[PDB]
Amino acid sequence: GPDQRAQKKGDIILGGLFPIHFGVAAKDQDLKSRPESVECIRYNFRGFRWLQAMIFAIEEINSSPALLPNLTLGYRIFDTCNTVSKALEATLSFVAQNKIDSLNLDEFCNCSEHIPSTIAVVGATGSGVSTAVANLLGLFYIPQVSYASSSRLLSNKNQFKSFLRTIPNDEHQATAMADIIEYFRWNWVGTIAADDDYGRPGIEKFREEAEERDICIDFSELISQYSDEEEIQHVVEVIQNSTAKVIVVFSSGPDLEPLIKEIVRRNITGKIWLASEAWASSSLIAMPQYFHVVGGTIGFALKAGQIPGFREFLKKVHPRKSVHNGFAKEFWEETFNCHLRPLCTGDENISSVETPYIDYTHLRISYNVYLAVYSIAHALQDIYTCLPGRGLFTNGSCADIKKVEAWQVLKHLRHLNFTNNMGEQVTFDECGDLVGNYSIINWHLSPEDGSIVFKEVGYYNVYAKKGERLFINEEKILWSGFSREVPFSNCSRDCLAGTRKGIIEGEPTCCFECVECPDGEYSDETDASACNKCPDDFWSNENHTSCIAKEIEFLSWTEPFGIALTLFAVLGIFLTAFVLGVFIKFRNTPIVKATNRELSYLLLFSLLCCFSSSLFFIGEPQDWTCRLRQPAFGISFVLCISCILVKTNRVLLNLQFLLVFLCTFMQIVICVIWLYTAPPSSYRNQELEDEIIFITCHEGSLMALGFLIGYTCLLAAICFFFAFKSRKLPENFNEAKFITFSMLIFFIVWISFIPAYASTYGKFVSAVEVIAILAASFGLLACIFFNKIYIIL
Amino acid sequence: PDQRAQKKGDIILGGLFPIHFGVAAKDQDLKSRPESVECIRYNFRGFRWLQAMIFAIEEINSSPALLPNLTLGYRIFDTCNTVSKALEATLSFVAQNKIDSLNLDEFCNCSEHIPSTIAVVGATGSGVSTAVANLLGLFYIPQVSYASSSRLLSNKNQFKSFLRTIPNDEHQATAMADIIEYFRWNWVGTIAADDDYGRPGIEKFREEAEERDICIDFSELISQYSDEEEIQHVVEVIQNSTAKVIVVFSSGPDLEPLIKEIVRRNITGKIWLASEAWASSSLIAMPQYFHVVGGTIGFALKAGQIPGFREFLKKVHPRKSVHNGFAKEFWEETFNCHLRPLCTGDENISSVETPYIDYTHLRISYNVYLAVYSIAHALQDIYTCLPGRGLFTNGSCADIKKVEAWQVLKHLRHLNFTNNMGEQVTFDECGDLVGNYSIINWHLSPEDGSIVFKEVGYYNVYAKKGERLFINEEKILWSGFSREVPFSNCSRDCLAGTRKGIIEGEPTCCFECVECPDGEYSDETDASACNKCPDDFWSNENHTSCIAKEIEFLSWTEPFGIALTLFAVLGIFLTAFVLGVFIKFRNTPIVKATNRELSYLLLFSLLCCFSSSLFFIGEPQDWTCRLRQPAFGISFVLCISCILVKTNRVLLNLQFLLVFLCTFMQIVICVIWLYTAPPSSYRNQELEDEIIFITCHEGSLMALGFLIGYTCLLAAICFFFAFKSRKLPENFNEAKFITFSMLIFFIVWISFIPAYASTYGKFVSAVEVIAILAASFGLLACIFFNKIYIIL
Ligand SMILES: CC(C)(Cc1ccc2ccccc2c1)NC[C@@H](O)COc1cccc(Cl)c1C#N
Ligand SMILES: CC(C)(Cc1ccc2ccccc2c1)NC[C@@H](O)COc1cccc(Cl)c1C#N
């Protein structure tokens, strides 16, 4: 197959596929010549590290007497070259003998089995590469234990029949990222994904999970190492134009480094980085000089494994010692820039030169290679101890450990369950997937150099139930580089009491607009979807803090206008009592004998009842009070006006007393008949002003109250007209002139109150009316009596 | 598999066709030895296609102009629609090249018993063909598929030898979108198969729909494994839509349960978009079911031209077939016996009707024929190649006996030839063909009653977008026997007069018709908003346009106007009668009794008052509204002052000067305030939307109150001066009539003020006049009438 290979032949052969070259040189064949295979022109240090890890694991299983004794494990490692075709060719190389045996018309070669039967293949890294290799291998039922290919597409086992892997699936990684976002109560986070089969499925699963967990995705940008600098700067700009301070990065370190450089140039030190496993264990991004730019990064990393003497084994790389692996020779030349360019001697010191794969603090992928190799070796050991009555096949059938076939190793690897050298339990299911415990780490400085120290800040345990898989000690984690405070990640602040969240079209539900509740609608609890409207009995303050009270409004005994009205009423009652006492004392004085004694007594009584009816419209209104406040005025003042009228009728020239009685009787019958027809009541009219409520009175019929007020006005007009005819004539101590003057006062008041009844309607209606009915009373009882007092005291 | 279709020749062609349609219904638990299992459901049409390939090979052999004296061999493997089976066959094809390429494997010392195959025909499974090309692309061995059509197969970062003889599904989806767009429909429901054919097609159709504003109601997936509940849900969502045009992108077996369910529920009359998969399938198209699903339009491949193909099909025989083992199986399953009862194999299939024998068109077989002839033409291109002249580096090309696949691939990627019918066929470097899709609609034949597929148009890819599709709509019979294009918009176009408003919850193509508000007009059908009329006009009930709002003010010609004109002319007649009586008599005793000049002034003021009544008439003007109130003031104050100076001298040339002084003070106040704030005319629209009123507004309301109060006060003074003096007779008892006339004036004022208030409306300019005239009609009557009564 490929010219470069690592081959050693023993009794058992394991497939080998790792990318030792960093990149294949892209090339399009002109088709004018015979087929040409594209070639890699780069070199990968970590791929060589993983290859060395596989070789050391195989050698250590060979040396260990307890595991697989009396056996030799050979290897055939072919560089992936990051190419599907190269891996397919290498896989073909692996399957030579069983393919020849299983293909008709090829048995005629009479082959002597020149290729030992490869049992299983370690690799490969490329996910689609792994898919194709599994497609080809499942035809022969030869197991493939991948170490770096992780994708939910690899979980489809209708095309795969021998697929197994030793790397956590991307579904778990995306779900763990979603769990990290959900745990810290964030909903506004940016997402960046790699433009490959590793980042795109991850971000798709992340979005699908965020749909369930009510998590929003501000932006979904794809970056790589081939993206233009303009694209990277555009990503940086939309990051700055983003409210989210938490950025979930699901990509590789090489894919992220240009963006990291651009952000470092622009000094954005407020973004929280969620790190995928690919770039959480890379030294291309972990730059302490850049730490303050990207400090506080949270990431998933594989726990360090136990590989004794791995660094010493790496120091044993030598083109002379290593003859079964040619790749090392290449790694030699690039270190010294010689080609045996000057000639290499093969003895130059290498301990004083550092390359990325030599330096490590923890092992993540080499550990996966080690575990996969040991899983294969443990299946081989289960075959080694197989007995006629032991094994996973019926009839208790086993196979020779020296002639082991892959169609038996496949069953052993599917039902395998053992313990690691550290003590970790390793098992497999019907899916054949191995998922480990991701370690959640943050970035810290060192108080001696300042180097980035990966402090374990939590663990994600896949063996636990979902909802408890994540554990994070928030105390250790730094935020914004070194600060100790959970950063705020929401599209909008939580609307406090008095502000509701209003759904806004064109934005996801996580981003809400806070809206002030209308007055009269209360929001007691913070973060309420709507504003609860207060009951009509009360009303809401602007703070909307649990609406408490409202404003009742009506005339009261205690208030400035109320005090003035009370004083005026008591003065009027005092004058009325003065007149009554003067009348009581004198019985046969000439001036009293001049007018009719009974009629004057009736007039005084009607004036008293009028002053009382003035007081009758006071205090908080009641149904009967509003039912009678107008009839009281009507009847009382009509009685008084009719008494004055019958004085004037006899003046002009016991009929007069009966006339007063008949008039007041007709009015009172009308009043009671209409009162039974439609009684006035009291209404608590809220719809006048929201803040203040008025409890007023409403009549049975407006026109019928107009009838009574017009009746009183008409009787007053008749009295005034009669006195006006008699104004000049002096009779009964010139009573007629005072009658005219008093009727003038009453008619003036009746004209005057109505503009004040209308203009200053407000609350003071119940006020103004009284200050009318009293004052008009204060007129009459004064005038028609004052003169008679002035001479008789 | 253990059965193969192999014939040996100088050149070997690869064959991958599904002889069986199903797959093994059991996957082992691997508790026993693991081994491949066999597909269990046969496919007659796959064997038919294999026979078509064999017939094409035989035709090439018989033709003396294409590859003479060169036998074309074949190695055809049954697919089972299985990925691994095709992978094993591909391995079989690439044995020698791989072994030579493999290191430490050439020690097998193979004599190269079977030469490497140059090209592979097949396969049907698109996902299968994916891995097939993945493996073949390693060695650059051309693979010309015939039934695998998918845009996912158009990738060229992995497919490096892939070619196909079936047009890409992108063209099919775009053509479906073009059918929807051409017939002007926006609401269509889409059903797709749960496989590698329906799903990419519906995805591409959805992608194309956004560009062409096509809207998709529902996207449902159906398959042969779907329960009856799923199919019934699909039927319900079909019935729950206004769309009669159904975009169906599915295979026949997947669609058949849905077809049976719809036939059961009797939904008569619909439009179906038929994919190539079910363009003419006998599992769907049946004469009995025509009335249920009549009016179907679908895409099909062009009819092929393969003479003798039916004869070769009639020539199949298990004893006469030595290079095709599967034919034996074809003889068994048809007759339900093995070569249960046994058969010798001496039967005949010509007289027995089976789906294999029956056919009316050639779509897949034509693709197989075209692929085989394309490979043959590439071989002939190698045949004509020279070592110093060719399409290669330095003209290097090996002998025809030493044919290599990579030489075949270069010729195939640049092929441009003509068919037996003469049609031009060319390929590209994308592995795609540029074939044309014909459009077929279902018609009944009154000769038999069978369904006849009439070619109603074509979708040609040799033209740019917007012109590729060509349909003769006249031929098409719609749902049932209807000749009218069915309606398939989301909702009817909002008629001019009502607007279309956006609603969220359904695609923006679907709109809500809302009646335009009054004051805004909709002059165009389908407008997102209602155009507001200019404030000079107002919209009619139909809201079609706004042509007339209303013009409102007192006019000479109207019932109240006629009454007012009659009353005014009567008043002017009485005034002229008084004036003439005054003119005639000069020294009569009654005129000498009162001051002659003062009475003349009173008559003049009454005339000016009647004129001022007329002054508030017709359409208002700036100066007219500027003076209509001062005119009343000045004139009636002059009259009232003349009566007042009569009364003042009665009670006991000062009186005339007093009138002049009073009217002068009023007129100076009037002019000073008139220069301060002139009244004008306002065309108040905000009183009622339909009708606009042109009224007058003063400079200051309180200032007009001043003048009216001045007039009322002078009237009160006159009434008082004549009130107590009512009894005293002087100057023919003038005082009594003075009191009576002042009463009339005051009554009229208190009478029109509530009339001015209540019936405001239009009749303000009416009511005021019927006041100012009637009050005038009072005074000029009273203070004069008595004097006429005795003197005539
Ligand atoms: C009639 C009166 C004003 C009582 C009253 C008091 C003192 C007086 C003193 C001197 C002479 C007459 C007097 C009359 N009470 C009427 C009010 O309650 C009720 O009226 C209304 C009630 C409802 C709606 C309206 Cl729009 C009105 C009025 N307008
Ligand atoms: C004062 C007058 C009514 C003229 C007039 C006519 C005839 C008369 C006959 C006898 C005695 C007085 C008379 C007065 N013109 C007033 C009207 O234009 C304008 O007033 C208003 C204008 C605007 C708004 C209001 Cl709310 C009012 C009133 N209110």
Swiss-Prot record, chain A:
<dbReference type="GO" id="GO:0035729">
    <property type="term" value="P:cellular response to hepatocyte growth factor stimulus"/>
</dbReference>
<dbReference type="GO" id="GO:0016323">
    <property type="term" value="C:basolateral plasma membrane"/>
</dbReference>
<feature type="binding site">
    <location>
        <position position="68"/>
    </location>
    <ligand>
        <name>Ca(2+)</name>
    </ligand>
</feature>
<feature type="site" description="Important for ability of agonist AMG 416 to activate G-protein-coupled receptor activity">
    <location>
        <position position="431"/>
    </location>
</feature>
<keyword id="KW-0479">Metal-binding</keyword>
<dbReference type="GO" id="GO:0070509">
    <property type="term" value="P:calcium ion import"/>
</dbReference>
<dbReference type="GO" id="GO:0071333">
    <property type="term" value="P:cellular response to glucose stimulus"/>
</dbReference>
<feature type="binding site">
    <location>
        <position position="218"/>
    </location>
    <ligand>
        <name>spermine</name>
    </ligand>
</feature>
<feature type="disulfide bond">
    <location>
        <begin position="386"/>
        <end position="398"/>
    </location>
</feature>
<keyword id="KW-0106">Calcium</keyword>
<feature type="disulfide bond">
    <location>
        <begin position="491"/>
        <end position="511"/>
    </location>
</feature>
<dbReference type="GO" id="GO:0045907">
    <property type="term" value="P:positive regulation of vasoconstriction"/>
</dbReference>
<feature type="glycosylation site" description="N-linked (GlcNAc...) asparagine">
    <location>
        <position position="110"/>
    </location>
</feature>
<feature type="topological domain" description="Cytoplasmic">
    <location>
        <begin position="586"/>
        <end position="597"/>
    </location>
</feature>
<feature type="binding site">
    <location>
        <position position="61"/>
    </location>
    <ligand>
        <name>Ca(2+)</name>
    </ligand>
</feature>
<feature type="glycosylation site" description="N-linked (GlcNAc...) asparagine">
    <location>
        <position position="543"/>
    </location>
</feature>
<feature type="binding site">
    <location>
        <position position="148"/>
    </location>
    <ligand>
        <name>L-tryptophan</name>
    </ligand>
</feature>
<feature type="glycosylation site" description="N-linked (GlcNAc...) asparagine">
    <location>
        <position position="241"/>
    </location>
</feature>
<feature type="region of interest" description="Cysteine-rich (CR)">
    <location>
        <begin position="491"/>
        <end position="561"/>
    </location>
</feature>
<feature type="transmembrane region" description="Helical; Name=1">
    <location>
        <begin position="560"/>
        <end position="585"/>
    </location>
</feature>
<feature type="binding site">
    <location>
        <begin position="364"/>
        <end position="366"/>
    </location>
    <ligand>
        <name>phosphate</name>
    </ligand>
</feature>
<dbReference type="GO" id="GO:0071404">
    <property type="term" value="P:cellular response to low-density lipoprotein particle stimulus"/>
</dbReference>
<dbReference type="GO" id="GO:0098978">
    <property type="term" value="C:glutamatergic synapse"/>
</dbReference>
<feature type="binding site">
    <location>
        <begin position="46"/>
        <end position="50"/>
    </location>
    <ligand>
        <name>phosphate</name>
    </ligand>
</feature>
<dbReference type="GO" id="GO:0007254">
    <property type="term" value="P:JNK cascade"/>
</dbReference>
<feature type="topological domain" description="Extracellular">
    <location>
        <begin position="678"/>
        <end position="701"/>
    </location>
</feature>
<dbReference type="GO" id="GO:0007635">
    <property type="term" value="P:chemosensory behavior"/>
</dbReference>
<dbReference type="GO" id="GO:0044325">
    <property type="term" value="F:transmembrane transporter binding"/>
</dbReference>
<dbReference type="GO" id="GO:0008284">
    <property type="term" value="P:positive regulation of cell population proliferation"/>
</dbReference>
<feature type="topological domain" description="Extracellular">
    <location>
        <begin position="761"/>
        <end position="764"/>
    </location>
</feature>
<protein>
    <recommendedName>
        <fullName>Extracellular calcium-sensing receptor</fullName>
    </recommendedName>
</protein>
<feature type="glycosylation site" description="N-linked (GlcNAc...) asparagine">
    <location>
        <position position="417"/>
    </location>
</feature>
<dbReference type="GO" id="GO:0090280">
    <property type="term" value="P:positive regulation of calcium ion import"/>
</dbReference>
<feature type="binding site">
    <location>
        <position position="150"/>
    </location>
    <ligand>
        <name>Ca(2+)</name>
    </ligand>
</feature>
<dbReference type="GO" id="GO:0016597">
    <property type="term" value="F:amino acid binding"/>
</dbReference>
<keyword id="KW-1133">Transmembrane helix</keyword>
<dbReference type="GO" id="GO:0050927">
    <property type="term" value="P:positive regulation of positive chemotaxis"/>
</dbReference>
<feature type="binding site">
    <location>
        <position position="127"/>
    </location>
    <ligand>
        <name>L-tryptophan</name>
    </ligand>
</feature>
<keyword id="KW-0732">Signal</keyword>
<dbReference type="GO" id="GO:0007200">
    <property type="term" value="P:phospholipase C-activating G protein-coupled receptor signaling pathway"/>
</dbReference>
<dbReference type="GO" id="GO:0043025">
    <property type="term" value="C:neuronal cell body"/>
</dbReference>
<comment type="similarity">
    <text>Belongs to the G-protein coupled receptor 3 family.</text>
</comment>
